[PDB]
Amino acid sequence: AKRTKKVGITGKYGVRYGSSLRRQVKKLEIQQHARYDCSFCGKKTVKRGAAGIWTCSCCKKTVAGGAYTVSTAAAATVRSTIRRLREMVEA
């Protein structure tokens, strides 16, 4: 069933902390919980071991990533910048 309408994972907080704070943390809490892609085996096994650590349940590779995502947007653009810049460096 639809147990709750829109608080979602932030329903455990009940009525406290204010609905805006609960909404702001809901979008981060779904992210730090959902299983993610694994760049090394292509499985939905990845889970946040710790704040910034993303272990794969299989193949035991852990990646340092964002505290609430396997790879944040600034990290993604840094990896793009490094790839592009090494591309000009090499050729």
Partner 1 sequence: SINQKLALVIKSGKYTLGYKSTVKSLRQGKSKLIIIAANTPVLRKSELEYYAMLSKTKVYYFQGGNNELGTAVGKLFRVGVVSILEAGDSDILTTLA
Partner 2 sequence: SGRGAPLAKVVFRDPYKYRLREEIFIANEGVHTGQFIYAGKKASLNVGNVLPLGSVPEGTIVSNVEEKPGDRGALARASGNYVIIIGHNPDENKTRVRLPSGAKKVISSDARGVIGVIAGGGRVDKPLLKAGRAFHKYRLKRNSWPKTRGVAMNPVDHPHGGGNHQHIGKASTISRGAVSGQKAGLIAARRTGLLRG
- Short-list 19, 48, 10, 20, CA closest to 32: 48
Taking CB under 8 A as the rule, does residue 42 contact partner 1? yes
Residue from 21, 30, 40, 58 that binds partner 1 (CB under 8 A)?
A: 40
Q: With respect to partner 1, which residue has the nearer C-beta, 14 or 42?
A: 42
**Least separation, in Å, of the C-beta of 7 and RNA?**
12
Site for partner 2 in 23-52 (CB under 8 A): 24-25, 28-29, 39-40, 50-52
Spatial separation of the C-alpha atoms in residues 49 and 32, rounded to whole Å:
10
**Least separation, in Å, of the C-beta of 32 and partner 2?**
8
What the block records as the tokens of 64 is 């340092």
Residue from 17, 30, 44, 58 that binds partner 2 (CB under 8 A)?
A: 17
What b/e string do you get for 41-53 counting C-beta neighbours within 10 Å, with b at 16 or more? Answer: eeeebbbbeeeee
